[PDB]
Amino acid sequence: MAALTDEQIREAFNLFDADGSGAIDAEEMALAMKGLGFGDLPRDEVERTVRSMNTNANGLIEYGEFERMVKSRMAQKDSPEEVLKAFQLFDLDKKGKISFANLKEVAKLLGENPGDDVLQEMIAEADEDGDGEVSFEEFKSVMMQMRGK
Numbered sequence: 001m002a003a004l005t006d007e008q009i010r011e012a013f014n015l016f017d018a019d020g021s022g023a024i025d026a027e028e029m030a031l032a033m034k035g036l037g038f039g040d041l042p043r044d045e046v047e048r049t050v051r052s053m054n055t056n057a058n059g060l061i062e063y064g065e066f067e068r069m070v071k072s073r074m075a076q077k078d079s080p081e082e083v084l085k086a087f088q089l090f091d092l093d094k095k096g097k098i099s100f101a102n103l104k105e106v107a108k109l110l111g112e113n114p115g116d117d118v119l120q121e122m123i124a125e126a127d128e129d130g131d132g133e134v135s136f137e138e139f140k141s142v143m144m145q146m147r148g149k
Contacts, residue, residue, distance in 0.1 A: 005074045013067055023060050026050055052115065076114040080143060087136055096135035100126075103134055 015032060016024045026046060033039055041049075053069040054061050078086075100123050107114070122139070129135040 004079070005077070009067060009070050009074065012070075013063070017063070023062075025059070025061065048117070052117070072113075073115055073118060075112060076118055080140075080147065083140065083143075087140070094137060096129070096133070096137045098134050098136070100132075100134050 015036075016029065019028060021028075030046065033041070049069070050061065051057075053065045055065070104119070123134065125142070126134045126136070126138055129138040
């Protein structure tokens with residue numbers, strides 16, 4: 001019915017819009033994040049997010065493209081338990097050795113159209129585990145570490 005992600009994006013857009021302005025700039029986004037003291041991302045994440053959402057650098061951000069983008073990147077990510085069970089079923093064991101190609105095919109087969117940046121970045125991170133290998137164990141571990149810390 002409803003996923004946590006939905007509530008997250010909903011509250012976010014609600015706060016940003018709360019300003020009562022026709023549009024929200026980067027300065028406002030940073031100020032809000034700081035005030036809440038939660039969800040503090042790096043500068044690179046801010047510039048990247050703005051670039052993706054705002055295709056045309058005109059010093060303004062659209063609400064439609066903003067929510068649309070956020071939902072796109074969020075669509076790729078899923079709950080911790082959901083992903084856990086999914087992997088367990090896909091593989092009873094934990095070899096952590098799977099060709100990136102196979103993973104891509106499976107993703108596209110699911111009907112998901114994530115951002116290219118998420119694909120290259122994902123493989124890059126998982127690749128750190130070894131040399132040309134994709135270990136889901138690494139990703140999962142990272143997610144858990146973040147949730148806790």
